[PDB]
């Protein structure tokens, strides 16, 4: 009895505590599994698996137990299969993907453990069950049984089941299993495909509507899994499907149409023609069908047939499009999101084959429609088609209808819709140069919506400017872009940051277009307005404001004072280390522009004075800033100033220039090659110095110099620096020794493993353990780093009495 309590203790140490406790306890259960026995152990495990309280990760760990005990127990599980299975089976039907895959995993392991004959003998009485739910799970159980074991192994059982004359429920479940096998396995079906089709094939012909339905769904699932291969396997079922298509009705026909839709993409171009035409006689009739399930199918079959290579673009243009537009492109279809997405997709695929203009010309008449949701549907379709195919196909007379309708739809939607914003931006960007005649109408429509009283509605108008200002450049740009910008300049006082971010995102788009002299709110008025906005808490505002101040610095440096730029740099300074990636990247780019704007000298003098007087947070920000002023502008303008700060006889400023140099070398990368010789003597002083933090961060400079200059020569200067790094190998402070290991791992790359080995050899067998520990730690980094390179560099070691240590193959001559 007490050993069952040990199972509790072991379960507890898996379900709770540190990972080695879990690992040990699992090892204990699994090796003890033979003694515990399957009966007691599953009487105890299955209650946890049945508990509603069990988390996903608890369940996953319990599965990681179940796999191993099943492997250990093996044949011992055979009496308990029935009990184990009924607790597990519901997982196969759980909506949670992970609960589901876990159930499949443990049925797989249970099926490897228990003999096939026992799985069959367990689940066979459920094949014949009256409940479709029991049959459904049983079908999913057997599919997993098939997956774990060989598919051929289960075939002789399926061959008996699908011909089980005494119960349609049984024959039905057989074909459910054959469907579920295809859904589970995927393309792995293919070498067993004809064996599976030849099990189903008689079912399509059967006297029971249920069996015909499930066999058509099995054939759909097999065809889906086989795509694009395996057509030769289905040659059996082609005749039965047409003979059914011509005859069946309702959801029993929807099943056959589903099968056919998956078969036509498998076919050669000649058969694709013949059999698509066979479909349309019935599929066009089903376009009238009231049933939403049928309507889901026929759109799928249209998408599949017209997507197939064989079927003529002209055939689609003549026989598909007229009845399709008639029955589906009408107001009633916008009402259901399922039909909505399916119709949009189907229609975009027709466009991919037949062309943009053939579809768009049947749709655009309804951009001017009454209903918002139907206008949304057509707009989403035009959005997708012109995103895929562009404007090339579209007639001038179709532009006129597009743009008229697009403008009408935008002025019509009561509430800001993303779809209308997408559609309008896409179509304008696609048309490009062709938009020129309509620009007054577009601008007026935008400007109207930009003067609207609603926050969201103005956000959408500014977003639309943001997405399309590049097209608006075309002509009278100064006139139109400029007034849009003056309206936006008023909204720079926005109460809502969501909106202000878009105002800024629209202003940003204007200055990326306008020549800065032609700006309508002059830059002298624009920048002061932005300076308080830089301090806004909201991410979208900060991003667009910093990025906009960026373009003003880049493109229009001359319009504002040195001191104006200097104050802006000093405010931007902390944003270089902001939490958000976007805010940092904007700050880095734009500090780089403003450093060019000011010129490097006084911005650097200001940064070096800040580096002496601030808290660690803002001091690290200045090290980032100084490096931007080096990569941008000139590095040679930065290093002379840093060299002078190091001549100040104070440990805190000196330590500061070492952090500045360490980041400068990380940041400028390959540019560092020009500068190693100049910075070398500073690093000698720093690395000879008594201070622990000088030697730590001089080592960090050497890491970044080394990794930055790899392959550009300079190994002379790096060998020289290694003579000052290397003595620090016996330092004991965590921070200095990790920085020294970092430097050595850098120099292994830039000087190479040969040199690093030459520094290790005399210490690997040195008398003192504290030398050996340190030298083997270094050697192991070089070895893991460069194992195959070391072959060339190992010294000649002479033979002993017992042992051969020469490498004779490398002594050979040719």
């Amino acid at each position: 009895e007490q050993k069952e309590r040990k199972i509790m203790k072991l379960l507890l140490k898996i379900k709770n505590g540190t990972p080695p406790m879990r690992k040990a306890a699992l090892r204990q259960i699994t090796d003890k599994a033979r003694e515990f026995g399957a009966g007691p152990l599953f009487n105890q495990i299955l209650p946890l698996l049945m508990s509603p309280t069990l988390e996903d990760q608890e369940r996953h760990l319990l599965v990681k137990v179940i796999d191993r005990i099943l492997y250990k127990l093996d044949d011992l599980v055979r009496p308990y299969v029935h009990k184990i299975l009924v607790v597990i089976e519901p997982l196969l039907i759980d909506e949670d993907y992970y609960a589901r895959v876990e159930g499949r995993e443990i049925i797989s392991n249970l099926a490897k453990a228990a003999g096939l004959a026992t799985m069959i003998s367990t689940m066979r009485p459920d094949i014949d069950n009256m409940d479709e739910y029991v049959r459904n799970t049983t079908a999913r159980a057997f599919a997993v049984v098939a997956s774990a074991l060989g598919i051929p192994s289960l075939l002789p059982f399926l061959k008996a089941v699908c011909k089980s004359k005494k119960s349609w429920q049984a024959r039905h479940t057989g074909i459910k299993i054959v469907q579920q096998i295809a859904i589970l396995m995927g393309c792995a079906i293919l070498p067993h495909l004809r064996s599976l089709v030849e099990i189903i094939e008689h079912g399509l012909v059967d006297e029971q509507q249920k069996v015909r339905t499930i066999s058509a769904l099995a054939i759909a699932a097999l065809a889906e899994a086989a795509t694009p291969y395996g057509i030769e396997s289905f040659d059996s079922v082609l005749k039965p499907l047409w003979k059914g298509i011509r005859q069946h009705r309702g959801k029993g026909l929807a099943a056959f149409l589903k099968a056919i839709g998956y078969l036509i993409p498998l076919m050669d171009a000649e058969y694709a023609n013949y059999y698509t035409r066979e479909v349309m006689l019935i599929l066009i009739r089903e376009f009238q069908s009231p049933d939403e399930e049928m309507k889901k199918i026929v759109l799928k079959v249209v998408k599949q047939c017209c997507g197939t290579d064989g079927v003529e673009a002209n055939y689609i243009k003549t026989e598909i499009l007229p009845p399709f537009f008639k029955h589906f492109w009408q107001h009633r279809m916008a009402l259901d999101r399922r039909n909505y997405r399916q119709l949009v997709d189907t229609t975009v695929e027709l466009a991919n084959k037949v062309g943009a203009a053939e579809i768009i010309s049947r749709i655009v008449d309804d951009l001017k429609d009454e209903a918002e949701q139907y206008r949304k549907m057509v707009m989403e379709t035009i959005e997708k088609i012109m995103g895929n195919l562009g404007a090339a196909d579209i007639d001038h007379k179709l532009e006129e209808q597009l743009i008229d309708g697009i403008l009408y739809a935008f002025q019509e939607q009561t509430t800001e819709d993303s779809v209308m914003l997408n559609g309008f931006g896409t179509v304008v960007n696609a048309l490009g140069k062709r938009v020129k005649p309509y620009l007054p109408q577009i601008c007026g429509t935008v400007l109207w919506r930009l003067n609207n009283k609603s926050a969201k509605v103005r956000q959408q108008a500014a977003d639309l400017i943001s997405r399309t200002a590049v097209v608006m450049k075309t002509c009278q740009e100064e006139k139109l872009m400029g007034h849009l910008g003056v309206v936006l300049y008023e909204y720079l006082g926005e109460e809502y940051p969501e909106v202000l971010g878009s105002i800024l995102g629209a202003l940003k788009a204007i200055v990326n277009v306008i020549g800065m002299h032609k700006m309508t709110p002059p830059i002298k008025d624009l920048l002061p307005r932005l300076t308080p906005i830089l301090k806004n808490r909201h991410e979208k505002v900060q991003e667009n404001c910093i990025d906009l101040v960026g373009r003003i610095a880049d493109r229009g440096a001359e319009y504002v004072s040195a001191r104006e730029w200097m104050r802006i740099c000093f405010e931007l300074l902390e944003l270089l280390k902001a939490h958000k990636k976007a805010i940092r990247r904007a700050t880095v780019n734009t500090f780089g522009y403003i450093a060019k704007a000011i010129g490097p000298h006084d911005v650097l003098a200001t940064l070096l004075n800040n580096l002496k007087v601030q808290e660690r947070q803002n001091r690290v920000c200045t090290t980032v800033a100084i490096a931007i002023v080096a990569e941008t502008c000139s590095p040679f303008t930065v290093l002379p100033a840093l060299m002078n700060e190091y001549r100040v006889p104070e440990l805190n400023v000196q330590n500061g220039v070492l952090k500045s140099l360490s980041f400068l070398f990380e940041y400028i990368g390959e540019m560092g090659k020009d500068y190693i010789y100049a910075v070398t003597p500073l690093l000698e002083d720093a690395l000879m110095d008594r201070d622990l933090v000088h030697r730590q961060t001089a080592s960090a400079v050497v890491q970044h110099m080394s990794l930055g200059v790899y392959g550009f020569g300079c190994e002379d200067s790096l060998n020289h620096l290694l003579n000052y790094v290397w003595p620090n190998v016996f330092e004991t402070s965590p921070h200095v020794i990790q920085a020294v290991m970092g430097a050595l791992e850098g120099l292994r790359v830039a000087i190479g493993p040969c040199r690093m080995l030459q520094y290790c050899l005399q210490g690997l067998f040195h008398p003192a353990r504290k030398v050996r520990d340190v030298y083997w730690k270094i050697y192991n980094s070089i070895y893991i780093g460069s194992q195959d390179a070391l072959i060339a560099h190992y010294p000649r070691i002479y033979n002993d009495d017992k042992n051969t240590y020469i490498r004779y193959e490398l002594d050979y001559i040719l």
């Binding site: 990972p19 988390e55 996903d56 990760q57 996953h60 992970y98 939490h579 958000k580 990636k581 940092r584 990380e666 940041y667 990368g669 890491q703 970044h704 990794l707 790899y710 791992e745 790359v749 780093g785």
Partner: protein, 81 residues
């Protein structure tokens, strides 16, 4: 400590606060190689975890250039544990 199981097909992710940092060195300079994590570290709740802190991942994790050069992309699944 780092996980160091053999990495697989799953891509490592980063939360907004840790966005753009290198998992190994915590530098924000020059992301170069996509981080790859082991299946166990990317399963269920573990799926979508920030490599550095385990938060919801808003972006793909990237090993820096300095780490890629040193072949520190190769040590195994850099999920911090």
């Amino acid at each position: 400590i780092f996980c160091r199981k053999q990495a697989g097909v799953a891509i490592g992710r980063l939360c907004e606060k840790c966005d753009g940092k290198c998992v190994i060195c915590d530098s924000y300079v020059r992301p170069c190689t996509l981080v790859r994590i082991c299946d166990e570290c990317n399963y269920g709740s573990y799926q979508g975890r920030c490599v550095i802190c385990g938060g919801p991942g808003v972006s793909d994790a990237y090993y820096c250039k300095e780490c890629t050069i040193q072949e520190k992309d190769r040590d195994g699944c850099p999920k911090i544990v």
